[PDB]
């Protein structure tokens, strides 16, 4: 019983975190086999952030300009190349702790664990969702760039996020591990801002099922709605549309609790229209949308 | 910016988790140097849980009755002893991954990370507080016994919790790593139940400071209260009394924000008496009490 914001165990990623320094800029890199991945803005100078040309900046670098430190051992850089917004630093030593891994781009609405790192040293681990507007509501301070987000399936780490920047509202933007940004963001100084966000409906329903599995039932009712009628209400409250695929994905949770998806949707409609009347669900006074159906199944009975 | 339920990186603990099997019962153990620690109820049988005498049950065991598996390697048990409610299984191999460690009993109101494990395999990591009533609101399923809670200071793991049981309300009870229970709980079948709980006032204030550091200011006001007058309000809302030591511990956060502790207390009084009027603080619609002042400083600017 119980339900927590639960991250994947971070050890397999800890053994990959290194420190990358160029000039006076230090940030984190990810060391897999004989390659270190890090944000390309490590090669930026103070008089470069407006309109930097990264191709020029990298042409002017040599391998010896990159100082890479794995704990107490300096790694010798023997090649450097750019891939989109990340840098690939080839080193003369393959990481003996390289896990089985994949580079996998996630969808908005999906969740992942973040290993926050500073100076190549892991500091904390937490669970994040990719928002519909392609930002993440992370917890990051200066120096955290290069920290990664990941999921773990059996023994295999699927890296999905590398941290690059903080937007003016305090949310975070980054790339996949091929260097391609999530969302309409760039690694330079502009007026860029997070666009409008929405609530991830399928996740809210998943979390209401978690609540029922954990004995929170007060929001249940005898009503069922239609998918069309539910989605009219979702639009009004800035919720994403619910699709039949979503209904299908909630099938296992529906069967375990005996509550049809469209029955649970009638509960969500009432919560949206009436509020909670001073009650809580799984310890929250708001409808939580950063747990996927998979997250609920993995964690709950 | 941002503020998350952040756990310590779990790798140093992952390398200590093993599986302990006695008869048909499997649970988790903690392998440090040449000793494996696990809950003594692994030696219970179905016809024992009412009034078990653990001293008799252990006298009737041999080393070969304990099957200990570290990943894919079976460890040979060469000694067994009881210490309070844990078992110490001496094995013929010292764990090469033993971190620097301490066994440290925590106070109610303090926080720690939990590495939830099944069959000796780590499954997830989350952050917990020890409640004033000596329970924890964990996330645990059958098979999770022996999972541990810990903090990490520099390179040193301070183990503070081993999981033993789930109470009827779905909260969790366990021991320190010397086998001594937190709270008035026993490792046998009784009508035992969590006592009444309270809200951890100093942590709520710490979290209001986190909110101010992160730009949430709407709950601030021009008023200051006295410590005595605040505590009259705390009692009415089932909050713990605020002491001068608490005020002192909040000193750094008070200085960073420029908000006197007794000034922030006037905000908390108003939130308790009036509610939030549909607003949120750090993404929550309720006053969060599972972040210590240390947690806020560690995570925030
Ligand atoms: C997207 C991006 C582009 C370029 C840069 N780099 C710079 O602007 C930069 C780089 C170098 C310098 C020169 N030196 C200044 C003194 N320190 C050493 C470097 C000055 C400025 C940083 C970023 N990203 C950043 N992320 C953060 C950040 C803060 C908090 C949480 N998450 C990310 C701050 S700057
Ligand atoms: C405190 C305590 C005392 C004794 C026991 N053990 C038993 O009651 C027990 C032990 C052995 C057996 C016999 N066999 C039954 C079939 N499986 C193999 C064992 C039957 C019952 C367990 C516990 N603790 C438990 N924790 C949980 C639990 C569930 C969910 C989350 N966290 C803890 C379930 S039982």
Swiss-Prot record, chains A, B:
Domain Peptidase C30: 1-301
Topological region Cytoplasmic: 1-301
Glycyl lysine isopeptide (Lys-Gly) (interchain with G-Cter in ubiquitin) cross-link site: 5, 90
Catalytic reactions on record: TSAVLQ-|-SGFRK-NH2 and SGVTFQ-|-GKFKK the two peptides corresponding to the two self-cleavage sites of the SARS 3C-like proteinase are the two most reactive peptide substrates. The enzyme exhibits a strong preference for substrates containing Gln at P1 position and Leu at P2 position
Catalytic residue list: 41 (for 3cl-pro activity), 145 (nucleophile)
Activity regulation info: Inhibited by pyridone-containing alpha-ketoamides compounds 13a and 13b. In turn, alpha-ketoamide 13b (tert-butyl (1-((S)-1-(((S)-4-(benzylamino)-3,4-dioxo-1-((S)-2-oxopyrrolidin-3-yl)butan-2-yl)amino)-3-cyclopropyl-1-oxopropan-2-yl)-2-oxo-1,2-dihydropyridin-3-yl)carbamate) inhibits SARS-CoV-2 replication in human lung cells. Inhibited ex vivo by michael acceptor inhibitor N3. Inhibited ex vivo by compound 11a and 11b.
Locations listed in the record: Host cytoplasm; Host Golgi apparatus; Host nucleus
Effect of residue 205 to V: In strain: Zeta/P.2
Superkingdom of source: Viruses
Complexes and interactors: 3CL-PRO exists as monomer and homodimer. Only the homodimer shows catalytic activity. Interacts with host FBXO22; this interaction promotes the proteasomal degradation of nsp5.
Protein function: Cleaves the C-terminus of replicase polyprotein at 11 sites. Recognizes substrates containing the core sequence [ILMVF]-Q-|-[SGACN]. Cleaves and inactivates human TRMT1, preventing tRNA guanine(26)-dimethylation of tRNAs. May cleave human NLRP1 in lung epithelial cells, thereby activating the NLRP1 inflammasome pathway. May cleave human GSDMD, triggering alternative GSDME-mediated epithelial cell death upon activation of the NLRP1 inflammasome, which may enhance the release interleukins 1B, 6, 16 and 18. Also able to bind an ADP-ribose-1''-phosphate (ADRP).
The protein, known as: 3C-like proteinase nsp5
């Amino acid at each position: 019983s119980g339900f927590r914001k639960m991250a994947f165990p971070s050890g397999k990623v800890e053994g990959c975190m290194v420190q990358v320094t160029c000039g006076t800029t230090t940030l984190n890199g990810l060391w897999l086999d004989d390659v270190v991945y890090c944000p390309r803005h490590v090669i930026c100078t103070s008089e470069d952030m407006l309109n930097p040309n990264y191709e020029d900046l990298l042409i002017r670098k040599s391998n010896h300009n990159f100082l890479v430190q794995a704990g107490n051992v300096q790694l010798r850089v023997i090649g450097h190349s750019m891939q989109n917004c990340v840098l690939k630093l080839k080193v003369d030593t393959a990481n003996p702790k390289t896990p089985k891994y994949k580079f996998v781009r996630i969808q908005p609405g999906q969740t992942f664990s973040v290993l926050a790192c500073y100076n190549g040293s892991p500091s904390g681990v937490y669970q994040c969702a990719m928002r519909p507007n392609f930002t993440i509501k992370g917890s990051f301070l200066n120096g955290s760039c290069g920290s990664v987000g990941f999921n773990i399936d059996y023994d295999c780490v699927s890296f999905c996020y590398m941290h690059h920047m903080e937007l003016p509202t305090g949310v975070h933007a980054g790339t996949d591990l091929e260097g391609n940004f999530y969302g309409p963001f760039v690694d330079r100084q502009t007026a860029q801002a997070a666009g409008t966000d929405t609530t991830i409906t399928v996740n809210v329903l998943a979390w209401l099922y978690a609540a029922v599995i954990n004995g929170d039932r007060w929001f249940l009712n005898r009503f069922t709605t239609t998918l069309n009628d539910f989605n009219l209400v979702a639009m009004k409250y800035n919720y994403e549309p619910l699709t039949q695929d979503h209904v299908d994905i909630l099938g296992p949770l529906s069967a375990q609790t005996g509550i049809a998806v469209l029955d649970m949707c009638a509960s969500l409609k009432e919560l949206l229209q009436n509020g909670m009347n001073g009650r809580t669900i799984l310890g929250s006074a708001l409808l939580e949308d950063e747990f996927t159906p998979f997250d609920v199944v993995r964690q709950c009975s």
